[PDB]
Amino acid sequence: DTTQNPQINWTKGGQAQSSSLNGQVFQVAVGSNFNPLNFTNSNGENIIVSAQQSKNNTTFASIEATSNPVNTSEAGRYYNVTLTATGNTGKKTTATYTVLITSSQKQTLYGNGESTISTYSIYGNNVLCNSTTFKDGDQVYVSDQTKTVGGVSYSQVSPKSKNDANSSNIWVKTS
Amino acid sequence: TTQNPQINWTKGGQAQSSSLNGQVFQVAVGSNFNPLNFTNSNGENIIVSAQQSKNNTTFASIEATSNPVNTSEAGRYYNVTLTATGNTGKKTTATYTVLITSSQKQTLYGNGESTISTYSIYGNNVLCNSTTFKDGDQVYVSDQTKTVGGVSYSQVSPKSKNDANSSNIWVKTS
Ligand SMILES: [Br-]
Ligand SMILES: [Br-]
Ligand SMILES: [Cl-]
Ligand SMILES: [Hg+2]
């Protein structure tokens, strides 16, 4: 009998998901900082796991990873993660998802309001409006080195590859 | 001949080393035409002057003794005769031909927007320019387009045809 058991919820990029966490398969990039209740996928979408007392009670329930062997150092490896949620009467629900380690971290660009995202080119210390624009939800490679000019931070990006992002001269304001 | 007035001209500010006599110019339908100072179809200012003689650069009086030019209809030509007079009363005349042409400018259509964005191109980078045009504006367009990221751009200038070749003001073609 399941109805009194904890319910495991998840959000992807802020949006509650209707599919069960159990049996999900995620991509995570080599070198990413992975926590089984809060991690970032290969495309840069934040995934957050949480739980409630039951299907009919949204009150917070405790949830923890009872098995998290995940290691992000090497691509082409997968790991299963098992979560267990426990309610106040001590009833349990577990969910198991699979994490695939992939090569590259992309980031998802959020206009946070606007449909359109402005880009810039930097020449010496002059920042010029570029004609290229991105749409909210576009996925790009981002160079690891930001640049600050007139007290504003900029990140160098490319839809092609990480290496291209290091010299693309297409910049967005850092979030 | 040497004691007679000499007729000079400039095009876009540069003194010309060809006689004004026998020149053929293009002038755009609808333009204001003055035979001593006018703007050709490509936007270059042409200015006529005269001097007392081959060796005396002192100003000499020059006027159109025959100017039937009418710019209202393209495909018509007119001859213009200029006569210069020196202070001893010696005369020189020059005759040039004016062709009335249709506009050598193109019209920019915003296809919706009142404003038309322009760009600057450096290598393969396209940057937003601050210059804007209004729908219906007329500009000179360079004959060489440039394509970047599969988008075609045309290089333009409101001033002259020649300026459009190096303005670094571009619009999206068509
Ligand atoms: Br994923
Ligand atoms: Br001409
Ligand atoms: Cl833009
Ligand atoms: Hg721009």
Residue numbers in the entry:
A (entry chain C): 188 to 362
B (entry chain A): 189 to 362
Quote the original article.
The full-length SlpX_ac shows differences in structure and domain arrangement compared to the SlpA architecture. The middle domain of SlpX, SlpX_ac_II, exhibits a SlpA_I-like domain fold and an additional repeat of the SlpA motif. The four residues observed in the vicinity of phosphates are conserved with the proposed binding motif of YxY….KxxN. These residues are not conserved in the third SlpA-motif, which is present in SlpX_ac_II. However, SlpX_ac_II contains an additional 3rd SlpA motif and an additional loop region, allowing for increased protein flexibility to incorporate into the assembled SlpA-SlpX S-layer.
